[PDB]
């Protein structure tokens, strides 16, 4: 199926406490594989996935230099936005960026993107056409104007079609045993009493990969999506994910409710009950 290469970047100012904290975190699909943190003792790009041991020392040196350059550029951006928005130099502000590309199972580019946010709000974003930008406010419009005169979209598009796609293909190839695996979810149902002769039934799905999964509760063959409660799929610290969805049912009738689990690692969906 399709795969993605994404970089989550964050620059955060802290007036009176030194330089902004700058961080880059990279993912191939749902797997963290590289990271840069300016607050580390000796800031360097570091591998976060075992298969990245396959890159030579030049890789790390070059990514570290790129990161330090990005760090300085963002330090400037923070000051620039203070001017665009007429804000004080005493408060903390945040710049966020998500950049990446997705390829199909054949390795060809499917889509690319780049979005910026200032203080948690949309700032500027690349349109699907990979040619123009859309600005959320008048400050971002200044940036859009600078980027159009500089050909920023064209440069980013060349990165997407070239560097992004090619290295994504290389990462999938090198970390194939990890990134192309499928860890089947293992499910269980827990039971908890409630006041009013009602029971909480909680369906758990553990140890699965990739992260996409569907957990539903059924009664009379109909999904109770409406009254269902749950948590966003979450990482479990070893490269796998977990999730749970619950429903409140009448005591003594738990047996009529069934949990359904659909995942890539389940040839046939799972069906369980208390």
């Amino acid at each position: 199926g399709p795969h993605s290469l994404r970089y989550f970047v964050t620059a955060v100012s802290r007036p009176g406490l030194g330089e902004p904290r700058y961080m880059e975190v990279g993912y191939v699909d749902d797997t963290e594989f590289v990271r840069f943190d300016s607050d580390a003792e000796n800031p360097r790009y570091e591998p976060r996935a075992r298969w990245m041991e396959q890159e030579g020392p030049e890789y790390w040196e070059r990514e570290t230099q790129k990161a330090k350059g990005n760090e300085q550029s963002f330090r400037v951006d923070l000051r620039t936005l203070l001017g665009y928005y007429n804000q004080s130099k005493g408060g903390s502000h945040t710049i966020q960026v998500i950049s990446g590309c997705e390829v199909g199972s054949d390795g060809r580019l499917l889509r690319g993107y780049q979005q910026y946010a200032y203080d948690g709000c949309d700032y500027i974003a690349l349109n699907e056409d990979l040619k123009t930008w859309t600005a959320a406010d008048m400050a971002a419009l200044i940036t859009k104007h600078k980027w159009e005169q500089a050909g920023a979209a064209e440069y980013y598009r060349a990165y997407l079609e070239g560097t992004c796609v090619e290295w994504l293909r290389r990462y999938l190839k090198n970390g194939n045993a990890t990134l192309l695996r499928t860890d089947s979810p293992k499910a269980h149902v827990t039971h908890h009493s409630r006041p009013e002769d009602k029971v909480t039934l909680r369906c758990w799905a553990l140890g699965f990969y990739p992260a996409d999964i569907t957990l539903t509760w059924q009664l009379n063959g109909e999904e109770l999506i409406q009254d269902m409660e749950l948590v966003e799929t979450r990482p479990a610290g070893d490269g796998t994910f977990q999730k749970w969805a619950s429903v409140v049912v009448p005591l003594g009738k738990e047996q009529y409710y069934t949990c359904h689990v659909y995942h890539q690692g389940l040839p046939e969906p799972l069906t369980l009950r208390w």
Binding site: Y7, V9, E24, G26, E63, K66, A67, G69, N70, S73, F74, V76, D77, T80, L81, I95, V97, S99, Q114, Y116, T143, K146, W147, A150, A152, Y155, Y156, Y159, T163, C164, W167
Partner: peptide, 8 residues
Amino acid sequence: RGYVYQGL
């Protein structure tokens, strides 16, 4: 590999 970001 990441992109070299452009100034705002």
